[PDB]
Amino acid sequence: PLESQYQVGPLLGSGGFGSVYSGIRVSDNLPVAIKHVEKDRISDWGELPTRVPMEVVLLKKVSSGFSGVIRLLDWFERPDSFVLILERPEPVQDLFDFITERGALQEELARSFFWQVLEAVRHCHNCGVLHRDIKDENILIDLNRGELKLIDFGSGALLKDTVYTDFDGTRVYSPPEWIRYHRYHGRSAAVWSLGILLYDMVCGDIPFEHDEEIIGGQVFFRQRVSSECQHLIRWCLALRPSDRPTFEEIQNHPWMQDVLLPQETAEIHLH
Amino acid sequence: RKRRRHPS
Ligand SMILES: N#C[C@H](c1ccnc(NCCc2cccnc2)n1)c1nc2ccccc2s1
Secondary structure (H helix, E strand, C coil), X not given: CHHXXXXXXXXXXXXXXXXXXXXXXXXXXXXXXXXXXXXXXCCCEXXXXXXXXXXXXXXXXXXXXXXXXXXXXXXXXXXXXXXXEEXXXXXXXXXXXXXXXXXXXXXXXXXXXXXXXXXXXXXXXXXXXXXXXXXXXXXXXXXXXXXXXXXXXXXXEECCCCCECCCCCCHHHCCHHHHHHCCECHHXXXXXXXXHHHHHHHHCCCCCCCHHHHHHCCCCCCCCCCHHHHHHHHHHCCCCHHXXXXXXXXXXXXXXXXXXXXXXXXXXXXX | CXXXXXXX
């Protein structure tokens, strides 16, 4: 049973995503996170290669190998909830709190972080998973290894090439075609959220709060940002989805060159 | 200026 395999520690967070606790796997003292989701709150259901929440399906699809995505270790069904056991980086801070405390990040640091988010999102898409809630709050930084982890697949979907008409991610990271038409395509919408993230990193906060700003097409820079970085941001936040870069184009952008290794990032910017 | 979290 769940209760004789994991020792439960403090609550790490709770909200729309459910309740997440720190834990330790009793057998080898491995650090884990234990996420609880109420059944009445699970909207999207899948079937496993058993009927489980879509989140479990998506996590299993991305859990193979080493990546910048959080790894599902196990899961349990209860009468009124599902419990997910995830790996837990330590020591860790989420990217939201990191930017709050440090302010606008040096571009070298934003380049390393953003590069790693790109690789993690490429991994997801390669595995047929669309995250749908890319934001600083959903990124953990392993402060010792300089490695980033994408968390909270609870808003995600199977990746398809047709239009999505549903969305329960974060509105301020959502693209103008969603705001205006309640329709988006997966990859192009992901690139928009990525531009919002990169702005957030180099400026200290997201560019837009209001629907009218999102749809407006104007990126005001509140911090000194290099012309190459401003250009990438603005390309990612092109109002027309087809004007947005592919993942390849992002990673081939001049601003993205000479990225730091994770360990160099940790040594220079985190230790 | 006020920075805030945003629920999903
Ligand atoms: N879903 C989900 C979440 C989640 C969603 C939204 N906000 C949070 N905030 C908690 C962030 C955090 C994580 C680790 C330590 N301290 C704080 N967490 C998390 N999943 C994991 C998985 C492994 C380790 C931590 C988390 S938090």
